[PDB]
Amino acid sequence: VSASSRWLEGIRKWYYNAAGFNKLGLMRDDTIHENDDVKEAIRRLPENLYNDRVFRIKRALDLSMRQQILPKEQWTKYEEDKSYLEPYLKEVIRERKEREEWAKK
Amino acid sequence: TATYAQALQSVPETQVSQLDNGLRVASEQSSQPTCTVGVWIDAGSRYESEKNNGAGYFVEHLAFKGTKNRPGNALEKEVESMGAHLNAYSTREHTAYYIKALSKDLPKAVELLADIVQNCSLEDSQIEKERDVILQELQENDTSMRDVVFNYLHATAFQGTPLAQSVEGPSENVRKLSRADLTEYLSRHYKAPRMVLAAAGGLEHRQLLDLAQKHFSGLSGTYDEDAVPTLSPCRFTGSQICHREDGLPLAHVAIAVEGPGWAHPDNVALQVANAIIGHYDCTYGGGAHLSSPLASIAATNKLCQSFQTFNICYADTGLLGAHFVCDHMSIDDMMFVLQGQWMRLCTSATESEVLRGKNLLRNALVSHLDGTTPVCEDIGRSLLTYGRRIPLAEWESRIAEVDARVVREVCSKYFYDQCPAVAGFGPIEQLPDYNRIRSGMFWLRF
Amino acid sequence: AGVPPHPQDLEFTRLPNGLVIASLENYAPASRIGLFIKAGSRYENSNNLGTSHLLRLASSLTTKGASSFKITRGIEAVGGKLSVTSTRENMAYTVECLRDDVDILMEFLLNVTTAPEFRRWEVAALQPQLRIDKAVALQNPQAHVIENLHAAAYRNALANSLYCPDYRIGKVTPVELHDYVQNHFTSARMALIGLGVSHPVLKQVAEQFLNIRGGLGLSGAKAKYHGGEIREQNGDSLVHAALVAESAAIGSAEANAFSVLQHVLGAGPHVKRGSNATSSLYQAVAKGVHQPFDVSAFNASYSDSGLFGFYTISQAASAGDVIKAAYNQVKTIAQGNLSNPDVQAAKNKLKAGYLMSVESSEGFLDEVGSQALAAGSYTPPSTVLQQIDAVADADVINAAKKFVSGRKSMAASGNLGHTPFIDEL
Amino acid sequence: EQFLNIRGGLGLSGAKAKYHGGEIREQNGDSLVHAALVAESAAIGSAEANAFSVL
Amino acid sequence: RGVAGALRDLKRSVLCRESLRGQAAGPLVASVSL
Amino acid sequence: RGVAGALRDLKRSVLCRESLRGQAAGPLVASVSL
Ligand SMILES: CCCCCC(=O)OC[C@H](COP(=O)([O-])OCCN)OC(=O)CCCCC
């Protein structure tokens, strides 16, 4: 399934580098907008993933202050970006939709 | 298989008979080795005047202390020896004495009850010993903020009427109640057409009637010429009583509007609405996910340690409302959320939550009449209030009639824009002003 | 004629995996189902103390088949109930509802007991409830004493508390809850009881969903009676004290003799505000003690041990007098001073008390579930009264002899300046 | 003599200390177990107390 | 509601001898619910 | 400063055998000051 799949993934990797959050050492889930679903998922993160999220964001804000980026060696590789928050967020959303479905009857 | 509705038909009919003197004899037969049998009397502190307000409770302290036939602890030894249990209680409208015993001991249990309610020997030496006991009980009851705040609610709600009085009476009454006051109370209220010999368990209604004509025929069924007591209606009063005592660690608050009474059909819909609001304790497991908005909000925000809704019924009146216990900085929020739910149900009750309240009441009704003693109480008390036993199939019919519209109409009739009675005890500086509470009983948006 | 129909008798089944099913169709408007599990606090050890308390508080946490929100709202929607009752030997997951909703609540019950997830964050938010739940229980002084009495009596297992030790609050892990369920909530340790349920349904449920293997053997390590004393100086208004000896395991004939001895000495009151005329302990203390007090025989029987004795409440200065008066009254019984009318009345109190304890569905269900795990059978009431009748007076005297001569365990709380030690009795 | 001439009060040593024997166990899950095991030995000032000190 | 049964907010005070009977314990049980 | 002597904020950890010697008690004393 290489022909058509790799072209789509090729455009996604293009956009990933164009977005440029990897240039500050960040991962995709570090950039999501914090709404109530996201605050709960972050709350549910285990100790290590929470502490890693804190330092990466702190390192990126420090760079943004200095208008700098990391050296190219330290950029977040597209293939190594871990969606550590997505599974927690999916459950938080699934729970809220259950409440909403019960609130309808 | 069997359905819920079919199970309601399988409940045995409660047989009812009346003696020549007027004593009503009622029973629900089961297949049990044990039973509960007792006498329910239509007497209580609402019938008592200010002079003798503590007599019925005083008589409760003397009922099991000796009779003319079995003096001293002779009665106490017979009950204990056959393994039976003798108990009693007094309310503002009803008095009850009942025995739990083996079914084989029903003939002796009935004999003892008749001996107690007729031939109670109120010996002077015993009256004086029970004097200091009751006074000590008054000191103990002062330490129960729940019992205190509910007596305060009656004191202000029915101010100036017999229902304002407590069951136990004032401290002064217990130190001057004479034997003549007690015998006058007994000979004036313990008449056969106001008593109900109720039973429940393994027993034939025939034998209960035989024991009734055997041990209760010797009872005065002929009232005095014009000394038949009649209950006057009790004026409800929108008012407030606040016992500020900051030395106590939690505030108790009781709020209520006037209810209709025992025999009003609207009680079924009112009990459904109270089931929607429900109750809460800090030891509940549900917490944030509880269905009741008041309960989930109280759990998530720690607004209280507990609350309960109630519908206390009397003859042609009652107290409909709630009571709660909370930290001194939470009284205002609990009052706000509580009243908001009353107004919400008056104006915006939905169908699904009403089915919830109906289901809770069905489970509450069936789960309560589970055992010989609760059924025996429902027999005796129902014959005083309703004049009959209301089968569970009838309660199901009244509950099924209830839908969202019925709750909105019934609740608005008793809650909306009505003056409540408020009772506060403890650290109640944050208890809202009465005008603000009264303003909480309507919505400007409606 | 309001004569009721013929009552159907209970049905009972032991599956080859050890599970026990017992149903009774009483055609009542409500149904009651309970899963009784040999998972009480005795099966904790010094490394996971309190794990069964937190487990008792976690029945509404998320499962694989039902979210936490759904368990609370689904049960409340049909007006049902979910409860978790726990002794030192058993945990009892019970569910109540009307007949037509048994399917709903059975599914919740199975998810709570066979598929809990123990989500890390849900468990963390529940930890403070241990402190609230413990604090509410321990405002009865009786709860302190009995918990200390068992800690002083035993070296292990039955020494464990029903409530989590304070040092463990916040420290119980989801792994410990998972491990506790996996090796204690197993078929050979379980009993599925149902009132207002058909036996084929329960048997179908048991074979389909309660075929859990693995785990641990039955009863774990044996309870080693030790003897000892724990004293809690707290300056309460009154002194509570309990003095016991090892008595007998439940199900043995010797245990009935202790039960009969309990009602000879005096177990509880029968008449409201009565003097307890036929209570031999109360009259013994009442002779030389005119201040307020209470005294009661204490009887606790378990799978592999038991505790018998008495419990006293008195003024702090009269504590020794009340205790010594109570202990001597038991000595006179051990010395053979016991009439036959005394034992016959005690059998009446005991036999009557047992029947009264099973007239409610709640009390009936607990008895059947308890018998299923303890005895592996159902013993009907008539046979229980038979076993009570078989108690001879000499059996009762011998039980009293066993208490007087046996190594004692004691617990007391209050101002203990006049509460004796064991060696002062 | 001026300020510490206080009379009244109680006798010396009050009530005598009655040795009992027993054990108190504190389950707290500390990293290490601390334990002390003793018997009644001797009052200070007696010759037997020096023997315990030497022991 | 949470239960502690053993018989076979300032709570309240027990003073007289009549109100003490029934209080002496007579095997603890702990029960929790919703 | 308040003292507790018996030898004849997370405090710290003792791990090795060398750092345990001297810790075993050897009659408690309590001292307070200004
Ligand atoms: C255009 C008008 C907007 C509504 C403002 C208003 O009426 O305020 C509410 C109060 C009366 O409501 P309440 O205090 O009984 O609370 C009822 C809550 N259920 O009225 C007052 O006395 C406040 C004085 C305002 C004068 C400017």
Side-chain angles (χ1 to χ4, degrees):
Chain A
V1 75
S2 173
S4 272
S5 182
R6 294 304 93 167
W7 183 241
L8 183 68
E9 293 292 336
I11 293 167
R12 289 169 168 169
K13 187 176 178 176
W14 167 85
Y15 179 84
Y16 182 92
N17 293 324
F21 56 86
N22 58 333
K23 300 176 183 164
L24 307 175
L26 294 171
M27 293 181 183
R28 187 200 64 176
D29 291 350
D30 303 353
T31 65
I32 190 164
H33 184 213
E34 286 198 355
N35 64 3
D36 285 352
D37 295 336
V38 166
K39 291 178 185 300
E40 179 60 20
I42 293 165
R43 199 185 66 79
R44 294 175 178 196
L45 291 173
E47 185 74 355
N48 62 310
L49 294 175
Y50 180 89
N51 290 347
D52 298 348
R53 180 177 211 274
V54 166
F55 172 66
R56 284 197 303 274
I57 291 163
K58 192 178 206 308
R59 180 177 59 188
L61 296 166
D62 178 74
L63 293 162
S64 173
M65 176 187 70
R66 295 185 287 92
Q67 302 292 359
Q68 275 289 344
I69 58 172
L70 301 173
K72 188 141 63 179
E73 287 73 9
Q74 299 175 225
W75 293 2
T76 315
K77 291 162 165 53
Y78 167 76
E79 296 82 351
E80 298 179 358
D81 189 302
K82 313 184 181 183
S83 39
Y84 63 92
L85 188 59
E86 196 68 6
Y88 300 93
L89 181 61
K90 183 172 171 296
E91 241 303 292
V92 167
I93 291 159
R94 197 169 76 97
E95 289 176 345
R96 176 173 52 74
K97 291 191 163 297
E98 183 172 27
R99 289 173 245 144
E100 291 166 6
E101 238 56 49
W102 270 83
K104 289 169 185 185
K105 56 178 73 175
Chain B
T1 192
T3 66
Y4 164 77
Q6 294 167 224
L8 298 172
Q9 308 300 131
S10 79
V11 178
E13 186 180 12
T14 304
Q15 306 302 332
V16 183
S17 301
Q18 183 168 317
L19 301 188
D20 290 323
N21 59 318
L23 177 61
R24 286 169 287 179
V25 183
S27 73
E28 185 194 88
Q29 181 174 345
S30 60
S31 294
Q32 298 287 294
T34 57
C35 72
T36 302
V37 51
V39 174
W40 273 253
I41 311 176
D42 216 335
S45 69
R46 186 180 167 165
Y47 301 82
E48 300 174 337
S49 66
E50 223 177 342
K51 294 300 178 180
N52 71 339
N53 185 23
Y57 186 73
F58 210 122
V59 168
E60 190 184 329
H61 280 55
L62 300 166
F64 306 153
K65 303 293 178 171
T67 59
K68 301 174 175 150
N69 296 314
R70 296 174 181 78
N73 59 20
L75 167 63
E76 179 178 320
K77 288 188 182 181
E78 281 193 308
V79 176
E80 284 163 357
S81 286
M82 65 185 171
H85 294 248
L86 179 63
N87 196 7
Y89 66 84
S90 322
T91 71
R92 293 185 165 75
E93 285 192 332
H94 304 119
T95 304
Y97 309 97
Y98 60 91
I99 295 165
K100 293 172 60 51
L102 301 174
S103 292
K104 92 193 217 178
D105 301 323
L106 181 66
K108 183 59 62 173
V110 172
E111 186 180 356
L112 298 175
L113 293 166
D115 197 20
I116 293 160
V117 178
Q118 303 180 28
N119 311 319
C120 184
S121 55
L122 309 105
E123 296 205 23
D124 295 334
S125 55
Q126 193 67 39
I127 290 166
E128 297 295 333
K129 287 185 181 183
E130 300 307 324
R131 222 172 270 204
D132 300 326
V133 171
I134 297 166
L135 291 166
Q136 291 229 257
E137 289 174 357
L138 297 176
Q139 296 189 83
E140 295 170 3
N141 299 0
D142 291 350
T143 60
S144 161
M145 295 184 69
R146 192 198 176 280
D147 292 8
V148 171
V149 71
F150 269 88
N151 279 333
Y152 282 174
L153 189 67
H154 289 75
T156 192
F158 303 109
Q159 60 181 253
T161 87
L163 278 173
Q165 295 173 323
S166 62
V167 185
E168 300 86 3
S171 173
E172 289 68 4
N173 276 20
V174 171
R175 315 167 167 94
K176 317 153 189 175
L177 267 161
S178 66
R179 187 178 190 272
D181 300 329
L182 301 174
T183 55
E184 196 284 339
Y185 177 87
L186 289 169
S187 68
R188 186 167 183 98
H189 294 291
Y190 282 23
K191 277 78 165 288
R194 288 153 56 80
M195 311 221 295
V196 177
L197 179 64
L203 56 95
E204 300 288 4
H205 180 66
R206 261 175 175 268
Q207 307 169 347
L208 189 69
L209 212 50
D210 294 325
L211 295 164
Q213 287 277 349
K214 186 172 196 306
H215 305 277
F216 291 94
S217 290
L219 185 61
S220 53
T222 86
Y223 291 95
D224 259 310
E225 73 295 343
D226 289 317
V228 168
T230 180
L231 287 180
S232 60
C234 292
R235 178 192 63 196
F236 184 93
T237 305
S239 49
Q240 178 161 274
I241 183 173
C242 296
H243 192 148
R244 181 149 181 203
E245 156 59 323
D246 289 342
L248 300 170
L250 296 167
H252 277 244
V253 181
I255 177 163
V257 304
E258 195 186 354
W262 276 93
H264 207 290
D266 291 352
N267 287 288
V268 180
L270 287 172
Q271 290 284 6
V272 169
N274 280 348
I276 295 164
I277 295 165
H279 41 86
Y280 177 74
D281 197 62
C282 65
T283 66
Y284 283 18
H289 305 308
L290 294 170
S291 305
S292 168
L294 179 63
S296 61
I297 294 162
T300 305
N301 295 273
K302 310 299 190 297
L303 298 179
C304 72
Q305 293 292 312
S306 71
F307 72 88
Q308 50 159 128
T309 53
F310 55 81
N311 179 35
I312 296 164
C313 302
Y314 298 117
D316 300 308
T317 192
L319 295 175
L320 175 70
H323 153 265
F324 58 83
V325 183
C326 69
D327 177 77
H328 68 115
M329 298 302 295
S330 303
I331 302 165
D332 194 17
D333 290 337
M334 275 299 301
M335 196 72 76
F336 173 75
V337 182
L338 170 56
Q339 296 185 300
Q341 293 304 311
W342 286 342
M343 299 299 98
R344 189 189 64 74
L345 294 176
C346 285
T347 62
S348 320
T350 78
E351 295 290 358
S352 55
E353 64 185 344
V354 171
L355 175 55
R356 225 177 69 250
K358 293 194 290 179
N359 288 333
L360 291 163
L361 202 63
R362 288 154 165 162
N363 275 271
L365 178 63
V366 170
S367 186
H368 174 79
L369 301 181
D370 184 29
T372 65
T373 301
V375 173
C376 191
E377 194 189 334
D378 185 51
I379 292 162
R381 183 168 56 176
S382 297
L383 264 68
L384 297 181
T385 62
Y386 309 132
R388 66 190 181 86
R389 187 79 190 282
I390 293 165
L392 295 94
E394 181 170 337
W395 292 121
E396 170 54 26
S397 301
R398 300 182 188 280
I399 290 167
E401 284 171 337
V402 177
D403 59 359
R405 193 199 186 162
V406 169
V407 171
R408 291 190 298 272
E409 292 181 1
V410 169
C411 287
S412 296
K413 181 180 175 178
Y414 297 96
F415 282 116
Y416 199 82
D417 197 20
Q418 301 287 4
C419 294
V422 175
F425 185 27
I428 54 175
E429 195 185 74
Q430 208 197 53
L431 183 63
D433 182 85
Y434 188 83
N435 283 294
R436 302 285 288 273
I437 295 172
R438 182 62 179 75
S439 291
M441 300 300 293
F442 65 87
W443 271 355
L444 299 164
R445 81 196 83 167
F446 184 68
Chain C
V3 299
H6 260 271
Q8 290 240 129
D9 55 7
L10 171 140
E11 309 218 42
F12 187 98
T13 294
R14 308 188 83 263
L15 300 180
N17 63 5
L19 183 61
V20 165
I21 306 100
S23 75
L24 170 57
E25 176 55 76
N26 54 9
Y27 300 114
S31 292
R32 192 180 296 268
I33 297 170
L35 187 69
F36 294 75
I37 318 180
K38 291 184 172 176
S41 54
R42 68 174 296 148
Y43 304 105
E44 303 174 1
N45 59 358
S46 69
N47 293 331
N48 72 342
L49 294 172
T51 297
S52 68
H53 183 193
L54 185 63
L55 184 60
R56 166 165 83 254
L57 304 183
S59 55
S60 59
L61 299 204
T62 293
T63 70
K64 294 174 198 169
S67 64
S68 176
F69 178 79
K70 185 176 179 185
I71 293 164
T72 299
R73 297 296 193 87
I75 294 168
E76 283 188 313
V78 305
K81 292 156 186 171
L82 172 60
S83 280
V84 182
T85 294
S86 291
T87 65
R88 285 184 153 69
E89 302 214 282
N90 303 130
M91 293 184 72
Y93 288 76
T94 300
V95 301
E96 191 186 319
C97 60
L98 305 180
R99 293 187 70 79
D100 314 324
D101 300 318
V102 161
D103 295 357
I104 293 164
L105 279 85
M106 190 100 70
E107 179 176 339
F108 289 124
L109 178 63
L110 295 170
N111 277 296
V112 165
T113 61
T114 70
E117 290 187 355
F118 300 121
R119 291 176 174 192
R120 151 176 64 83
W121 50 91
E122 296 193 356
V123 172
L126 184 59
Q127 294 284 342
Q129 191 61 26
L130 292 163
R131 181 168 289 96
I132 306 164
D133 191 53
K134 187 176 176 182
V136 165
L138 257 59
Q139 67 202 39
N140 313 123
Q142 299 89 343
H144 284 272
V145 172
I146 289 162
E147 296 290 283
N148 286 143
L149 183 71
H150 285 82
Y154 296 99
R155 305 179 196 269
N156 68 316
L158 282 173
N160 296 346
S161 184
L162 292 174
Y163 302 94
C164 182
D166 294 350
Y167 83 96
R168 287 278 293 165
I169 288 169
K171 295 279 165 302
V172 186
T173 72
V175 171
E176 290 170 341
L177 290 164
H178 279 293
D179 291 338
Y180 202 93
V181 167
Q182 284 172 24
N183 56 31
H184 298 125
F185 287 39
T186 65
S187 305
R189 310 174 63 82
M190 282 186 166
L192 179 61
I193 319 300
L195 306 199
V197 184
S198 86
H199 205 64
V201 175
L202 281 185
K203 197 178 188 177
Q204 181 57 20
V205 168
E207 293 175 324
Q208 212 195 317
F209 303 99
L210 296 170
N211 185 30
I212 316 301
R213 314 89 154 189
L216 251 296
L218 293 171
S219 300
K222 199 191 186 204
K224 311 175 265 176
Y225 185 86
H226 179 214
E229 45 190 334
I230 292 166
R231 294 167 67 87
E232 188 182 5
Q233 177 69 24
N234 61 30
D236 283 343
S237 50
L238 302 171
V239 162
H240 292 245
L243 177 70
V244 303
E246 184 165 41
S247 50
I250 197 175
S252 69
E254 192 184 15
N256 298 331
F258 276 97
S259 298
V260 171
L261 180 65
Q262 188 191 197
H263 288 254
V264 169
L265 292 170
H270 298 253
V271 178
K272 192 180 185 184
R273 291 181 268 257
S275 61
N276 311 96
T278 72
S279 178
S280 154
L281 275 179
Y282 207 100
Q283 301 298 315
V285 175
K287 204 170 172 180
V289 179
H290 308 289
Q291 273 170 2
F293 68 94
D294 192 26
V295 62
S296 164
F298 183 89
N299 193 42
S301 193
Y302 304 101
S303 68
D304 58 354
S305 182
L307 297 178
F308 183 87
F310 56 88
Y311 193 104
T312 64
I313 300 167
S314 71
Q315 307 302 124
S318 302
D321 299 329
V322 170
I323 292 162
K324 296 175 184 173
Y327 188 27
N328 290 166
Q329 177 55 218
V330 181
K331 288 180 173 176
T332 58
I333 295 305
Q335 291 166 353
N337 308 305
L338 180 68
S339 78
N340 189 250
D342 288 333
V343 175
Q344 203 61 230
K347 285 177 185 177
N348 301 343
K349 297 174 187 174
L350 180 66
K351 288 190 289 186
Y354 177 73
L355 301 174
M356 293 177 182
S357 74
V358 295
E359 334 173 89
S360 64
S361 301
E362 194 197 291
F364 179 76
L365 190 93
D366 178 43
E367 179 60 26
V368 174
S370 301
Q371 291 182 27
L373 293 183
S377 72
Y378 172 67
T379 310
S382 63
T383 307
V384 172
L385 308 193
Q386 213 192 238
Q387 292 155 2
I388 292 164
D389 281 356
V391 173
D393 301 28
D395 298 324
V396 175
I397 291 161
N398 275 285
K401 284 191 188 179
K402 183 158 182 165
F403 164 78
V404 172
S405 62
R407 203 177 153 174
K408 298 296 189 305
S409 299
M410 192 176 174
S413 63
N415 192 342
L416 307 178
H418 294 90
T419 300
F421 296 88
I422 287 163
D423 61 4
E424 298 179 334
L425 295 178
Chain D
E1 293 175 324
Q2 212 195 317
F3 303 99
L4 296 170
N5 185 30
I6 316 301
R7 314 89 154 189
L10 251 296
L12 293 171
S13 300
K16 199 191 186 204
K18 311 175 265 176
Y19 185 86
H20 179 214
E23 45 190 334
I24 292 166
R25 294 167 67 87
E26 188 182 5
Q27 177 69 24
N28 61 30
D30 283 343
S31 50
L32 302 171
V33 162
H34 292 245
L37 177 70
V38 303
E40 184 165 41
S41 50
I44 197 175
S46 69
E48 192 184 15
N50 298 331
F52 276 97
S53 298
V54 171
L55 180 65
Chain E
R1 335 191 280 258
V3 192
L7 303 168
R8 281 160 252 170
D9 197 17
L10 70 170
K11 171 242 192 85
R12 83 198 327 280
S13 291
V14 196
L15 279 160
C16 68
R17 184 164 50 263
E18 284 68 48
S19 299
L20 273 172
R21 190 74 197 101
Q23 290 279 119
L28 237 184
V29 193
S31 187
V32 179
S33 198
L34 314 192
Chain F
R1 335 191 280 258
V3 192
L7 303 168
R8 281 160 252 170
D9 197 17
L10 70 170
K11 171 242 192 85
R12 83 198 327 280
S13 291
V14 196
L15 279 160
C16 68
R17 184 164 50 263
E18 284 68 48
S19 299
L20 273 172
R21 190 74 197 101
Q23 290 279 119
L28 237 184
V29 193
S31 187
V32 179
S33 198
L34 314 192

